[PDB]
């Protein structure tokens, strides 16, 4: 769903204040960097490197939010929050979930910008 995976209001504002090119430009940079980010999370997880997990989750949180991918930003926030009581149990699922869905979320943003312009 659009309203659920994307930050629609922020996106519509950017279309007006900046235009779609810088969005599609960011998207393209996001898409090429994600593979290495997920890998790093995956590796920090298996090595039981908490600080490492939290560092990469923050990085992805920042990157996703800049392009309006609200849902991925929300996952990165959880991954970077070890004060959450269920962090220990759930961090593995959040990372896997991110792994399986990031490309899909990117395809939804792309369709939206294409329709929105
Ligand atoms: Zn998800």
Curated annotation (Swiss-Prot):
It is found in: Cell inner membrane. The modification Phosphohistidine is found at residue 58. Residues 19-112 form the HPt domain. Activation requires a sequential transfer of a phosphate group from a His in the primary transmitter domain, to an Asp in the receiver domain and to a His in the secondary transmitter domain. It comes from the Bacteria. Signal peptide: none annotated. Member of the two-component regulatory system ArcB/ArcA. Sensor-regulator protein for anaerobic repression of the arc modulon. Activates ArcA via a four-step phosphorelay. This is Aerobic respiration control sensor protein ArcB. It comes from Escherichia coli (strain K12).
């Amino acid at each position: 769903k659009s309203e659920a995976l994307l930050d629609i209001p922020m996106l519509e504002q950017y279309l007006e204040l900046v235009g779609p090119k810088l969005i599609t430009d960011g998207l393209a940079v996001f898409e090429k960097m994600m593979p290495g980010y997920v890998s790093v999370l995956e590796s920090n997880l298996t090595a039981q490197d908490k600080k490492g997990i939290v560092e990469e989750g923050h990085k992805i949180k920042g990157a996703a939010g800049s392009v309006g991918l609200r849902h991925l930003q929300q996952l990165g926030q959880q991954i970077q929050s070890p004060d959450l009581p269920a962090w220990e149990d759930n961090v593995g699922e959040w990372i896997e979930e991110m792994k399986e869905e990031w490309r899909h979320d990117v395809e939804v943003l792309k369709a939206w910008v294409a329709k929105a312009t």
